[PDB]
């Protein structure tokens, strides 16, 4: 069948530390044919003008 190939670790800081950018994390993949790093839009606040 198929599986998650592991689970993720703790997140990293955002690229702008304000909300209009992205954050990332790494993991210990169970097999060589799986994604080991990802990104998403962060949850920070109060960006500059």
Curated annotation (Swiss-Prot):
Residues 3-48 form the TSP type-1 domain. Disulfide bonds join 5-34, 14-42, 18-47. It is found in: Cell membrane. Residues 44-49 have a biased composition (Basic and acidic residues). This is Thrombospondin-related anonymous protein. It comes from Plasmodium falciparum.
């Amino acid at each position: 069948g198929s599986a998650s190939c592991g689970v993720w670790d703790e997140w990293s800081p955002c690229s702008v530390t304000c909300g209009k950018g992205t954050r990332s994390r790494k993991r210990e993949i169970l097999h060589e044919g799986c994604t080991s790093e990802i990104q998403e839009q962060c949850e920070e606040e109060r960006c500059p003008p």
